[PDB]
Amino acid sequence: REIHQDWANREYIEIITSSIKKIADFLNSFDMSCRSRLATLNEKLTALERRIEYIEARVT
Template sequence: MVLRGGLWVSALPLIAVPSLTPLCTMEPSDYSSEIQEDWTNRENSETICTSLKTVVEFLNRFHSSCRTRLAEMDNRLKTLERKMDRLDAHTAYNVTIQEQIRRNAAT
């Protein structure tokens, strides 16, 4: 799987079906077994491709969901950081005022 444009896509090439034996060199009795083997290979290839598509779709949905949740979490953290900065400023201001009051009371 490869991430392209924010979506996961399969990096695997399509599965090649083995070439069939030329029909002119085969006995008629071999046709059905060769055809059956070909259909089995095609079904297996289709199953693998379908499974890969399912995995890719899941990964794309998961990626999108995680991106949204992380953006929400980032916004919450920024809000908390602003609140902490405000509290820090208030605390520093109050400490400064208290020190000035003590100095004035001491004189």
């Protein structure tokens, strides 16, 4: 009866929504990790730029 099909459809929608929220959570986590390692790379680059400034000032 229509109620049975209704239960089936609601279960379908529930599965799809769960998948969508999994995708969103992955997006958030990936963004956080990328921020962290970008900060690290930037710091490393900054440490290197200052060092080359100092060296080339010492050699001239």
